[PDB]
Amino acid sequence: QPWLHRLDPAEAAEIDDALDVLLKSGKPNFAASPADFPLPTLGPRLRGIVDSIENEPGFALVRGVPVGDKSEDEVRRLYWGLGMYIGVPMIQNNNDSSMVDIRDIGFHIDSTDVVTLLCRRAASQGGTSLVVSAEAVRREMSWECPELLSALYEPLPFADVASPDDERPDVFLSPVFGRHEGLTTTRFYIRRVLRSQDNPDAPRLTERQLEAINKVEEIAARPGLVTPMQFEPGDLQMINNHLVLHGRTAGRHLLRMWFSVPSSRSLPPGYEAAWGTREGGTLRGAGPRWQLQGEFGEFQRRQAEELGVAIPA
């Protein structure tokens, strides 16, 4: 498939050699640069793949990352090395983590420009990853139930993933479907919309809005629109959250990273509350207060200058 990019032996061996440089450098992750994880041929190719998910269908699966003979610690450093050719990593939670373990789901986006998942160990049976184009869903609705689209273009309340108190979350407004200068952007997450109601000041969800978001979920789950993906050790999935909704079917171990990327799209008016800034190619996304602190923060600035990602002041 066009979204599948396989690594050949030389490229896999190139990653092993890159990790050796990183391990032998005596530098910790947050002090490293791409020169400490050299990918002479795979580097430019990875940048190109990340650039390509700015277009439909908005995701890519890289296959063949050599993780089988590595320790868990070594895989994380390898993953960190690959991330230096993807984007600027972001803190993802209130625990100052920039790499989250997924071990032992309705369609949704992650609150970041690009999310990646590296599979170290695959699920025995279930755990099939599901991805769908948000624009394809919007287009089905435009044929089948256009009367509901207006509800998804008006801003709806979302609980902020960065809320310190999840029982009384901070809330921002965002449309589910938007577009700016011809580039579409989506935000969909039923749980976050329902949780927004725990803030008594947030607007109340009308039944029309509830009907519309439920319609989005129903259509996204249809066979004709879904692309299933059964992760194998060494798979690196990359998703553009402006274009893709992702989900999962019912000793797995995946590693998640969040990235700001230099090719991200500028956003429509009013999207500052949800994303921090409208301008594309900037350091943005969930939990602004988490970012740009300590050694990790100094890595973000160096990495942003390396890839050409602007840091809003």
Next chain:
Amino acid sequence: GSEFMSDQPWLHRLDPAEAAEIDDALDVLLKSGKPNFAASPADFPLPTLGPRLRGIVDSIENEPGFALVRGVPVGDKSEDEVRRLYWGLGMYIGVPMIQNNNDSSMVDIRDIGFHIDSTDVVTLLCRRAASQGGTSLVVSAEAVRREMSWECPELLSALYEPLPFADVASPDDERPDVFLSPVFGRHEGLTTTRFYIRRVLRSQDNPDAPRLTERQLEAINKVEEIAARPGLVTPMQFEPGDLQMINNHLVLHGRTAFGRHLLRMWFSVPSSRSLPPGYEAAWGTREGGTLRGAGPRWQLQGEFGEFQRRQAEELGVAIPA
């Protein structure tokens, strides 16, 4: 990519050898002594351009849904000779259709209103171009529908429900026959459109046709408004020898205001799309790749009808029984 050509991808130029091939083909046709309705590709041989023409007509089933062939040698020909040349080219395009109540299968166009023609593929051969203006305009119907899905989705339902159209095949234009058809439809993943405001408004002259509701009038007006926007329109300035080919299921066409002379033909084609339920009234048959379109009663009669059957068998166009 790595190359960026001057010509648009929908522009197909003829080289000298291809032009000479048409000149030679016309010589064969004129020297055979056969009239148009008795001829076959054997009487207008295009060894290299024939297959290329078939491929271009097949390719307009996909986006962008139109093509402009440039360089047909018409400059030194009489009006009569250009018509014979055009007829020869049509034997590699599709099965020609009767277009009006005077049994014409080649109509003269002489001296906005986006619309389709009531046929699968319409072609225009430019013998003479207008000195100033007269720019041909084409727009993607699905692109118009998609703007509406963003800007005014509440109006789309009115365009998916059948609307009344005056039938071009009506004997009495002041008392037209009327059929119902949606403005936008899709079947098995392939979209189809019908749009022509004048025809929709003229349907009201038939007292039996349904009266146009406010939502329908607002919706069709919105389609016209969006189609005329600069960002969606593709202009084309015809030159002598240009052959424009348009797939009416995907493209709406129009013209800007002003010795113009174009020749129009209508074709059933073997790669045409199957249509949604209820489209029989407007098209005759839903099945794709069949002889269909406006005025079924006009077709398959006399010598022209026998040419249609021979031509349909050559190209693989089915004739429903």
